[model samples]
Target: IPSSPVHLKRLKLLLLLLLLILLLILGALLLGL
Candidate 1:
């Protein structure tokens, strides 16, 4: 499927964003410790 690559790239970007948000939250929590 020609669109497969594009879909995968988008999915990866979304996962990366989610991971970044999670890390930011974790950092905030640790800062409060």
Candidate 2:
């Protein structure tokens, strides 16, 4: 089979990245200017 383990790592990394981005966006909105 292909590089199955690598696929899982990518998924986890993507999830964390998305979560961090979302947190930052929401935080900025709540903080306002």
**Which stretch of 10 consecutive residues in model 2 shows the poorest summed lDDT?**
24-33
For candidate 1, write residues 1-33 as lDDT tens digits. 267788899999999999999999999998894
Off by more than 4 A, model 2: 1-3
lDDT of 2 by residue, 1-33 (tens): 667988999999999999999998999998883
TM-score of each: 0.75, 0.69
